[PDB]
Amino acid sequence: YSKIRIVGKIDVLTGLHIGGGGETSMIGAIASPVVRDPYSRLPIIPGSSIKGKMRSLLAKHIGLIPGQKMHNQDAPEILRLFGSSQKGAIQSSRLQISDAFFSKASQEEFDKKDLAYTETKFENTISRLTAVANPRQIERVTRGASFDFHIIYNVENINEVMADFENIKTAIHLLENDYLGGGGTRGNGRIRFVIDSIDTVVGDFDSSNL
Amino acid sequence: YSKIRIVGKIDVLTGLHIGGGGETSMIGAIASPVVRDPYSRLPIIPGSSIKGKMRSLLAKHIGLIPGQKMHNQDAPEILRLFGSSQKGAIQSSRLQISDAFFSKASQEEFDKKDLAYTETKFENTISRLTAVANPRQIERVTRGASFDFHIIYNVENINEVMADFENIKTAIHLLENDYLGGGGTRGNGRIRFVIDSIDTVVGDFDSSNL
Amino acid sequence: YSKIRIVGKIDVLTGLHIGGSMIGAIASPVVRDPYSRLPIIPGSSIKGKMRSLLAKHIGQDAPEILRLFGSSQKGAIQSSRLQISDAFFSKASQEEFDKKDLAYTETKFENTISRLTAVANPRQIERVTRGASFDFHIIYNVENINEVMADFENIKTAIHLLENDYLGGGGTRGNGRIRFVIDSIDTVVGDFDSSNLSIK
Amino acid sequence: AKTKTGEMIDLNFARKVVEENKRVKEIVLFNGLTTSKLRNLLELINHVYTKVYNSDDTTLSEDVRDELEYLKVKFAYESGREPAVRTFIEKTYVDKLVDVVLKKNTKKIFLDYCKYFEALVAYAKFYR
Amino acid sequence: VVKLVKLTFKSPVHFGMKRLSDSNHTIAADTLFSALIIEALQQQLELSHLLNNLVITDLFPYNKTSYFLPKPLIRIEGYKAFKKLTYIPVENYSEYLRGEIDSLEASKIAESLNLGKASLSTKVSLQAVDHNGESEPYSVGNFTFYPESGLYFLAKGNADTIGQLEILMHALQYSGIGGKRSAGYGQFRCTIEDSGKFDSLLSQTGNIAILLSSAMASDEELVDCLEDARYLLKKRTGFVQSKTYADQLVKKKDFYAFSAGSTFYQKFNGKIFDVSDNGRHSVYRYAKAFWLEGKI
Amino acid sequence: FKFELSNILKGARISVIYSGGDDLFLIGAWDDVISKALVLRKAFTRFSAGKLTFSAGIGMYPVKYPISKMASETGVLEDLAKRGEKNQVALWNDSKVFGWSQLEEQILKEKMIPLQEALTNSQEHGKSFLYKMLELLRNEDQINIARLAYLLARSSLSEELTQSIFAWSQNKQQKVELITAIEYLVYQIRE
């Protein structure tokens, strides 16, 4: 059994907004706060949000079956990688995608020039009925920000490792051309992946070609 | 599943004002600033503004149903292109319009002339019963500036790609014949679109004709 | 017959959810101490995760994992060597969270998008806030002296896997990343020498 | 803190003071105060509130104290420009409470002042 | 040599009585004696000395304020409060024997008990999931003691017996007591000290006698003791817990013993009983009697 | 307990596990169990001429939830209502304990019925509006009371209900009742 560690950077090409919960809002304050690491108050990218977006894009690329009801009806590669919960056909997820935290390098860069980690984007919605704008404030992680992402791959079937990493590269290529987080169709969440390394932390597996 | 990337430039024919709040200024100083990228401090064109203006103009051109109240009630082409959230008829957004950033060529051109990217336009309102001026100072992006946009089109149905790009062309023509940002009715935000490359980044769709 | 106390702190690298209602309210509360209301990590979860990771690494049927975590099979009754106490939220972390008025357990809002209607369903989960620390006590029972080193190497492999693995909750989605810091290894009962033995 | 005639300053007093000023005519608050001037003052206090919110230390830093001083200056300027803003500021004692917050020099008192301001805005919206 | 042993429990305990879901706040003397026997077997210590020379008391609650003994089974001339009153502070218990305790003070004593809180942990078995199966949930009872509160018991024996008990309890601190030990429960710390108060309650002369431990007499002693008694006959059943006993786990022979706190006008000596059937080693059950003398 | 109870439950998705003697145990739809428990209470009062009252605990569980855990956890809820002096009922969560007259009149009829007609009558109002009010409620800070008024001002709700909802929120006891009123409406209107 082997575990392959993929550590890298996610660079915010356009402002990133992933929702946050449990905070009531002051009148005139941000309508939509982002998810933040409560200990550090810095924004983070939830591992689930990347895994869900990556899996959704990869599944759309592979092709969904007609009238697919559940996530467990995906292609065998998608279930092999991200996991399945079919009754009597449970497959362990090979991809454990952890939460991406605001990097200390970007922390230093934003402490220089006295730049806030997040920025409030003021928006409105002009109605099709009365043509009256309805303002909102969306918090978004700044464009300069970088997040340290850490993924683990579980080497269960060696013969499928190369195909699984090909699918991972396809999914990440889709995600770079897609967005992450919410509001992406209106310019939010565009990202770039920079793979610092693909190490093997567990086992004797040779991962230099991945 | 294909992803076609449209890349070009937005040229500011008339000073562009996209309002962004959250700024306190000295008595008598600039009253209304523009939206800027916090990291660079350079003016920005949000993808929300581009998408909203294009969708509004396209919906007006195709037609508004009598007594329309919401955006999900727009024409099926508009819902197919820009997205929808109607109950039971959630349609994904094929267009993912991104924030347009200040072009580096335009930045160097302005630095050549020792010119500021943003000008403070001085305006006033003459009362109709007292005829007393009320002064305002509106920040605008200087004419002659270019913003390089970035749009992603998701080819979900191969049949409708030609019609979708025809609608995108119509929307961009309307936006060129229209304004962007605030104050455009009084001569602000006139822009021109210069398309540089339409290519299929993801997949094997043929984007030569488009 | 000797016993080896392992004293350690588990650090929550990403929000920890061990599970264990009213509308609009977190429907997935973490395990908490019934009296002090401090969230805890059941020793059963640690023991089961370690046993599962050892099963995956070695491969349950294997004699080593079965002796370490107990066996009740007919003709093969084995006492569990690893008795792991439920982890207790640490005092130092409790003070560090009392400062700056930080709650002990963050709530995480999550949504699922259906593959058919594209609708989104929202779940609020409770996670032990990243940066917390749980004291962990493990008792290793030296049933046989000859197998102590091998059992401790197995523990070390299990710990390393769990460092690279998660603990409880949905760990493929980021939750449960933990780091084990062992304060000390010592022979509480018996004359056995555990100075050379390191869990990590 | 407290007002003249020994009354207590709280969100209950925010409701009470928005109600006593409330005059039927249209609903007129503080002799012609409009929602827009109230939202401008709320924008000022919101900028200061964001400054303090981002911070964690209870003691108010020097920059936020200078922000409160400039808030008092803006209060005076708006009072001079518009009679209704002057009436609102003197009836709700917002500048006096800015002085009190500066005297106390803690995050709790500033957050309570922000809550009082927000309650004034909310009840002004409700009673219109 | 009466020695008070106080157990302060760091983690919750199961202390099962009939199922895995239910949890008892205390354990009977037979459970603690079986744990001591198991510990002596592990520590390679002889069982004969412990079996013969040691008489132990049931585990009973205590707080920082009071140590609680079982309610004696004596006639009461309201009744719901006495039913709810399971444990009485030792100073109150002499008053209860004198019959001065009224219903309101009985309810006050019952509410005074702050031993701890009983909970139920919900766990799973994921073993089937690997072998193409589904996970199965289950439940484990728990009882978490308040920080001041704990359990205690009195043990009488010879000096060597007391020292052996000290060593066995030092080991039991890490071995644990109760169900689902070695799976996250039952861990405790023990402190053994002489207790003047208990010795004063121990030394006493009265018309009536009350058990401090679950016990049952032999037939010869039964003939004399049974008459003129008020007792609760509780069943002691369980599965054998050993590797040596059999290839597969086998239930113990059902036993029936007088509950602790039962009142006998005639005292009986206890007997260590054998509930083994067709096993490699005899399974021992503790039924020795610890007596307190009282006047009603 | 046995003969008359069957007539009381007529027309409701309720199954009597046992009535025994004084202690009852019933399992049924969450909507009908609450309704019949009130109907049981009013019929019991007439039967006993007011000299007798009974305390009950009501729980809400999914179908797949074990039966044994339903009896154990709901018995503790009864134990809460029994703990208070005489007539009490524990609905759903332990915190929500109300008098039988309070649950039937102050919650279901005084507050929930105006809320039910509110959603139907107003196109703008949606479950989203209910949840937003519910978040402002359940907040000890008095500031949320002002925020509720701010939320109610732009909500475009009817004036009489807007005054009613504001008045209920300010009172400490009436807030609990208003919270329960929304919850019941939210549960009743799902899917």
HEC letters along chain A: CEEEEEEEEEEECCCECCECCCCCCCCCCCCECECECCCCCCEEECHHHHHHHHHHHHHHHHCCCCCCCCHHHCCHHHHHHHCCCECCECCCCCEEECCEEECHHHHHHHHHHHCCCEEEEEECCCCCCCCCCCCEEEEEECCCCEEEEEEEEEECCHHHHHHHHHHHHHHHHHHHHCECCCCHHHCCCEEEEEEEEEEEEECCCCCCCC
CB nearest to C172's CB, from A38, A96, A201: A96
Q: In A106-145, which positions are buried (b, 16+ CB within 10 angstroms) versus exposed (e)?
A: beebbeeeebebbbbbbbeeeebeeeeeeeebbbbbbbbb
Instruction: Give the separation between CA D3 and CA D9, rounded to whole angstroms.
Output: 7
| Partner B contacted by C116 (CB < 8 A) | no
Using DSSP bridges, classify how beta strands B150-155 and B95-97 pair: parallel, antiparallel or unpaired.
Answer: antiparallel
Q: What are phi and psi of C7, to 5 degrees?
A: -115, 130
Between chains, do F142 and D14 touch, taking CB under 8 Å as contact? no
Secondary structure element (H or E) that encloses residue B21, with its range? none
D47 CB within 8 Å of a chain B CB: yes
Q: What token pair was written down for A140?
A: 């978004």
DSSP class of residue F105 equals I
Measure CB to CB from residue D77 to each of B21, B24, B27 and give the nearest one.
B27
Which amino acid appears at position F59 of this protein?
Answer: G
Tokens of E256: 């029936």
Q: Do chains E and D touch (3 or more CB pairs under 8 A)?
A: no
| Radius of gyration in angstroms for the set of CA atoms belonging to chain D, rounded to a whole number | 14
Sign for the pseudo-dihedral over CA of F146, F150, F155, F159: positive
CA distance A178 to E179: 54
| F144 interfacial to chain A (CB closer than 8 Å) | yes
Give the residues across from A96 on adjacent strands: A152
Cβ pair A24:F136 closer than 8 A = yes
- Return the structure tokens found at A12: 């915010």
In B63-121, alpha helices (H):
76-82, 104-113
Contact C23 F135 (CB under 8 A): no
Alpha carbons B11 and B189: distance in angstroms, whole number: 10
CA-derived radius of gyration, chain A:
19
Chains E and B touch (3+ CB pairs under 8 A): no
Handedness of CA E51, E54, E55, E57 (dihedral sign): negative
Residue type at F185 in one-letter notation? L
DSSP state letter for F52: -
Measured in angstroms, the CA of B24 and the nearest CA of chain A are apart by 15
Query: With an 8 Å Cβ cutoff, are D11 and F154 in contact?
Result: no
Chain F residues whose beta carbon lies within 8 Å of the beta carbon of residue A24: 135-136, 139, 144, 147
The answer to whether C62 contacts chain A (CB < 8 Å) is no
Round to whole Å and give the CA distance between C36 and C91: 12
Residue B196, helix vs strand vs coil: strand
Eight-state DSSP code of residue E191: E
d(CA E260, CA E29): 9
Q: Cβ of D114 under 8 Å from any chain A Cβ?
A: yes
Report the 10 Å Cβ neighbour count for E97: 23
- Residue among C188, C114, C197, C105 nearest C156 (CA): C197
Which element (helix H / strand E) includes E268? none
The whole-angstrom separation of Cα B82 and Cα B96 is 8
Touching partners of F (3+ C-beta pairs < 8 Å): A, C, D
Q: In 10 A of CB B108, how many CB atoms?
A: 9
Largest CA distance in chain B: 67
Query: Which residue of C86, C142, C186 is the best one to mutate when testing the E interface, meaning the one whose CB has the most E CBs within 10 A?
Result: C86
Tokens 């600033």 locate to: B33
Q: How far is CA E86 from CA E23, E93, E104, E111, E261, in A?
A: 16, 11, 14, 10, 10
Residues in E closer than 8 angstroms to C55, CB to CB, are 130
Q: Which residues of C touch F183 (CB under 8 A)?
A: 22-24
3-state DSSP assignment of residue F35:
helix
Q: Which residue of C has its CA nearest to A99?
A: C174
Distances (CA, A) of E99 to B201, E72, E89, E295: 93, 11, 14, 9
Closest CA–CA distance from residue D44 to any residue of chain B (Å): 7
Q: Residue written as tokens 């267009």?
A: B95
Q: Where are the alpha helices (DSSP H) in D22-106?
A: 35-54, 62-81, 83-92, 94-104
Buried b (16+ CB within 10 A) or exposed e, E139-163: bbbbbbbeeebbbbbbbbbeeebbe
Q: Are E226 and E84 in contact (CB under 8 A)?
A: no
Cα four-point dihedral sign B22, B25, B31, B35? negative
CA gap E255, E232 in Å, rounded:
14
- Give the C:E interface size as CB pairs under 8 Å: 87
Tokens describing residue A46: 């939830």
Q: Which residues contact E194 (CB under 8 A, 6 or more apart)?
A: E2, E3, E4
In 3D, which of E165, E164, E195, E189 has the Cα closest to residue E177? E189
Pick C35's closest partner by Cβ from E116, E181, E185: E116
State whether residue B48 sits within 8 Å of chain C by CB.
no
For E49, other C-beta atoms within 10 Å of its C-beta total: 16
The resolution, in angstroms to one decimal, equals 2.9
Element at E10 (helix H, strand E):
none
Q: Do chains F and A touch (3 or more CB pairs under 8 A)?
A: yes
Inter-chain touch C175–A51, beta carbons under 8 Å: no
| Residues B3, B110: Cα–Cα separation, whole Å | 34
Nearest CA in chain D to F163: D126
Contact C122, C113 (CB under 8 A): no
Could you tell me if B16 and B181 are in contact, meaning their C-beta atoms sit under 8 angstroms apart?
Answer: yes
- By the 10 Å C-beta count (0-12 exposed, 13-18 middle, 19+ buried), B156 is classed as middle
**DSSP tag of F110:** I
Chain-chain contact of B24 with D77 (C-beta, under 8 angstroms): no
- Give the chain F residue nearest A23 (alpha carbons): F135
**Contact (CB, 8 A) for A210 and A165:** yes
C-alpha distance from residue F14 to each of A195, F17, F18, F59, F103 (Å)? 60, 9, 12, 14, 20
CA dihedral F41, F47, F48, F52 (to 10 degrees): -20
D56 to chain A: which residues are within 8 Å by CB? 41
d(CA B97, CA B82): 9
Confirm or reject contact between B68 and chain A (CB < 8 A): yes
Contact criterion met (CB below 8 Å) for C64 and C54:
yes
Strands laid side by side in the F97-98 sheet: F56-58, F89-91, F97-98
Contact in structure between E258 and E232 (CB atoms under 8 Å): yes
Q: How far apart are CA C89 and CA C32, in angstroms?
A: 10
Say whether F186 and C24 touch across the interface (CB within 8 A).
Answer: yes
With b for 16 or more beta-carbon neighbours within 10 A and e for fewer, the B157-166 pattern comes to eeebbeebbe
Please give the residue of chain A at the shortest CA–CA distance from B4: A177
Tell me the residue length of chain F. 191
* Under 8 Å between Cβ of A207 and A165: no
Partners of C137 in the β-ladder: C7
Which amino acid belongs to residue B59?
A
CB contact under 8 A, C22 and F92: yes
Which residue type occupies B166? E
Taking CA atoms, E257 is separated from C88, E155, F189, in Å, by 38, 19, 57
Cα B22 off chain centre by: 21
Chain A residues closer than 8 Å to D39 by CB:
28
Q: Is the Cβ pair F93, C24 closer than 8 Å?
A: no
At a CB cut-off of 8 Å and minimum separation 6, what does C162 contact? C49, C50, C53, C178, C180
**Separation of alpha carbons F73 and B27, rounded Å:** 65
Neighbour tally for D111: CB within 10 Å: 17
Residue E18 CB-density burial (10 A; 0-12 exposed, 13-18 middle, 19+ buried): exposed
Q: How many Cβ contacts (< 8 angstroms) between chains A and F?
A: 7
Task: Count the Cβ atoms, other than its own, within 10 Å of residue B135.
Answer: 10
The owner of tokens 């049924």 is F28
Write the single-letter amino acid at A129: L
Q: List beta partners, residue C182.
A: C8
Determine phi and psi for E186, rounding to 5 degrees.
80, 5
Q: Report DSSP letters for C97-147, one per residue.
A: HHGGG--SEEEEEEEEE-TTT--EEEEEEEEEPTT-EEEEEEEEEES-GGG
Task: Indicate yes or no: CB of D125 within 8 angstroms of CB of F154.
Answer: yes
Q: Among candidates F90, B15, C56, C20, which has minimal Cα distance to E130?
A: C56
Of F128, F133, F178, residue with least CA distance to F152? F133
Helix, strand or coil, per DSSP, at residue F130: helix
Cβ distance A26 to D114 less than 8 Å, yes or no, reads yes
**A68–chain C nearest CA distance, Å:** 6
Q: Are the beta carbons of F36 and F14 closer than 8 angstroms?
A: yes
3 state DSSP class of B141: strand
Residues of D in contact with F152 (CB under 8 A): 126
Residues with Cβ within 8 Å of E68's Cβ and at least 6 positions away in sequence, in order, are E60, E61, E62, E87, E88, E89, E90, E113, E115
Determination technique used: cryo-EM
Helix (H, G, I), strand (E, B) or coil at B133: strand
Contacting residues of C for B86, CB less than 8 Å apart:
none
Which of C 20-79 lie inside 8 A of E, CB atoms?
A: 20, 31, 33-35, 42-44, 46-48, 52, 55, 60, 70, 72, 74-75, 77-79
Contact F149 D126 (CB under 8 A): yes
Residues sharing a CB contact under 8 Å with residue E79, sequence separation 6 or more, in sequence order: none
Instruction: With CB atoms and an 8 Å threshold, state whether D46 touches A26.
Output: yes
Report the neighbours of A using a cutoff of 3 or more CB pairs below 8 angstroms: B, C, D, E, F
Q: Which two tokens stand for residue B161?
A: 């790609």
